[PDB]
Amino acid sequence: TQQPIVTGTSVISMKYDNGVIIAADNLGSYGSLLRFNGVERLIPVGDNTVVGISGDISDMQHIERLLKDLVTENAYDNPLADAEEALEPSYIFEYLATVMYQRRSKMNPLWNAIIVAGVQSNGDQFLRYVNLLGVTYSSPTLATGFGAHMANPLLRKVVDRESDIPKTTVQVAEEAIVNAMRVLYYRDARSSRNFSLAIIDKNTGLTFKKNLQVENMKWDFAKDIKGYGTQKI
């Protein structure tokens, strides 16, 4: 049993007609102190999977190392490591889910919430969540922490059920996610303006975008708000 020290906030994601999108800001908080700003919380594995992690950062770094080892190991005595026997997004998730549940069962968890986003070899979209309790689930949209409360409602207005997936384009989807990131920056006190976003398309492959920023924010109306009730000036 432990307690998280350096933490990463929300990880939001969703799937569209040809793939999945996943994003996460670049902050590493230390309680109320916004301590680190160059933190990458999106972990690409191969070119068909991206693992987004929130929660304890030291544990994230540990999971990172676990992931690199998976890749190294899978290549051992594997002439098809970059083909028929390359790591599938579903293998990566099952592995992490197994570790997460084993660790919680030993009462020594990896204090994280994880979303594995990717595209299977047959083209199918893959989006599944696993957390420190070993709990797992799938939905057209997935978000951790604060994003679960504010991002899911927005992303679900785009893809409210399975049938909405084939009707959603990368443009529409990426737009939703980028809007959600801005909302989170407005109401989440542990968020950052800078974030990374990744797209995994069954045709265009893995596109990883770094150093994005929340733009087009509305603050002007703030000048009109004075006092907390009766004050006029």
């Binding site: 005595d77 594997n78 002439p79 098809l80 028929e84 026997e85 599938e88 579903s90 293998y91 998730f93 099952e94 592995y95 197994t98």
Partner: protein
């Protein structure tokens, strides 16, 4: 000579041989014949079950390791049980932890390694059984030949056991033919029974004497015995 260097597996002979291992191999030759061959869509196992008395059964020579893998044995039955059990666990581990079916080539590597340990350490003994492993994975049909020395080889077809050389030359001849028997199991099996009959001498394959197993594209490893093999005699 030999007598002074064959008291255990931890002793090299003056010419670099390992007699205990060689003697183990001799147990395979004494074993009943079994044949394995594959096309690009299926893999087949044909094994001649040997009986003790005419009041006894014809010992099973094929064990299923998973829905997509299985093998045939020649030699010490108990050792085959130990090795297949190990293979069943390895297949199982792959599914539970990675939600991935074990690659036939990976299984071969695992068996080689498990057998090798029993040839370099004092107190143990080499396995006294030969195995033919067939399976259908993410790279198609596969056939493997396992020897107690720890040597595992991938082939289009082969045979082990007494008079196995018969079936082997036949397959090394029929090669170009059967390797193209795609989409037609009955043909592949018939070709398997034709290779095996090339190692007969004593009797002729009967109904409670023939054992066949197949796996492929849309066929989970299944075993046919008795009446089920009647249409091939």
């Amino acid at each position: 000579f030999r007598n002074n260097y064959d008291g255990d597996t931890v002793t090299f002979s003056p010419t670099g041989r390992l007699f205990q291992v060689e003697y183990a191999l001799e147990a395979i030759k004494q074993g009943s014949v079994t044949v394995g061959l594959r096309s690009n869509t299926h893999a087949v196992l044909v094994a001649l079950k040997r009986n003790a008395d005419e009041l006894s059964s014809y010992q099973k020579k094929i064990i299923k390791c998973d829905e997509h893998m299985g093998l045939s044995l020649a030699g010490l039955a108990p050792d085959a049980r130990v090795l297949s059990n190990y293979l069943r666990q390895q297949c199982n581990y792959s599914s539970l932890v990675f939600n991935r079916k074990l690659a036939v080539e990976r299984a071969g590597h695992l068996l080689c390694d498990k057998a090798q340990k029993n040839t370099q350490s004092y107190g143990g003994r080499p396995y006294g059984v030969g195995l033919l492993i067939i399976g259908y994975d993410k790279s198609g049909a596969h056939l493997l030949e396992f020897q107690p020395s720890g040597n595992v080889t991938e082939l289009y077809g082969t045979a082990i056991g007494a008079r196995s050389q018969g079936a082997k030359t036949y397959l090394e001849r029929t090669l170009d033919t059967f390797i193209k028997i795609d989409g037609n199991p009955d043909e592949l099996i018939k070709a398997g029974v034709e290779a095996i009959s090339q190692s007969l001498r004593d009797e002729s394959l009967t109904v409670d004497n023939l054992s066949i197993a197949i796996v492929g594209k849309d066929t989970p490893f299944t075993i046919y015995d008795g009446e089920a093999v009647a249409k091939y005699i």
